[PDB]
Design a protein around this ligand. Structure first.
Ligand SMILES: NC(=[NH2+])c1ccc2[nH]c(-c3ccccc3O)nc2c1
Lengths: 9, 245
């Protein structure tokens, strides 16, 4: 839904 | 990348592939880049310097292969191409080698999040990892300096950050490297970035986040002893970035 910089999983 | 493993974009969901069109029918790869926000990708000015015609570059997100599609990929046009004023090249180094690309899709939207598209985090003003940190670089560049084609599968590798003191030793790069640059090499000079890897990310972890620490910029040879790869030091450009985003 929205981005979370750095999160791959 | 010399050395490394082959990977898929799920492992670098912020990696962007920039290509150039030759209306003759072909599109060629230019350089790599990283997604900062929904609509902005950052790369390196020397990738665009010789042909700054935005209208001819295409950017893809969620791509694991170089010339074949990957499902989930997004394609965008470059709405804005911002190169750095004060960019310079000498016999080796590139100064102020960072570029911003504003993207827009044919529908008028920016990147959307998925399991193959994520943004990378930026560092805080002049906040870097300490030399010794192991970081990863990724890209579609050469696998050997003598190759004349790029791999078809994305690759990744780990390199360690070295200090400026070490990198400016006369037998390394002397004063060609400045404090707005970072050097990273493999202890055994076995893996490194190379031609075709320009613009892509050097990701390290900072404060608990995977941060875009550097931008693949230049190097003498690839995986050569005492010839580290040099990256632009993103932490020293934070204001410049802010002034345009
Ligand atoms: N050895 C390295 N760490 C390195 C990294 C990126 C490079 N990019 C290039 C390059 C060469 C010719 C034209 C464009 C490029 O990005 N050489 C490169 C060398």
């Amino acid at each position: 839904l929205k981005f979370q910089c750095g999160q791959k999983t | 990348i010399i050395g490394g493993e082959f990977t898929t974009i799920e492992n670098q969901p912020w990696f962007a592939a920039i290509y150039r069109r030759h209306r003759g029918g072909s599109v060629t790869y230019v350089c790599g880049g990283s997604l900062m926000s929904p609509c902005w990708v950052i790369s390196a000015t020397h990738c665009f310097i010789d042909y700054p015609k935005k209208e001819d570059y295409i950017v893809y997100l969620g791509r694991s292969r170089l010339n074949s599609n990957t499902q989930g990929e997004m394609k965008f046009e470059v709405e804005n191409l911002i190169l750095h004023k004060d960019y310079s090249a000498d016999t080796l180094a590139h100064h102020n080698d960072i570029a911003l690309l504003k993207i827009r899709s044919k529908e008028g939207r920016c990147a959307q999040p998925s399991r193959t598209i994520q943004t990378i985090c930026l560092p805080s003003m002049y906040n870097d990892p300490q030399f010794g940190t192991s970081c990863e670089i990724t890209g579609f560049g050469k696998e050997a300096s003598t190759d004349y084609l790029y791999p078809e599968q994305l690759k990744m590798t780990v390199v360690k950050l070295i200090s400026h003191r070490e990198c400016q030793q006369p037998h390394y790069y002397g004063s060609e490297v400045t404090t707005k640059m970072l050097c990273a090499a493999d202890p055994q000079w076995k893996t490194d970035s190379c031609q075709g890897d320009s613009g892509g990310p050097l990701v390290c972890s900072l404060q608990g986040r995977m941060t875009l620490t550097g931008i693949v910029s230049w190097g003498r040879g690839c995986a050569l002893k005492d010839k580290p790869g040099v990256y632009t030091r993103v932490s020293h450009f934070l204001p410049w970035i802010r002034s345009h985003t």
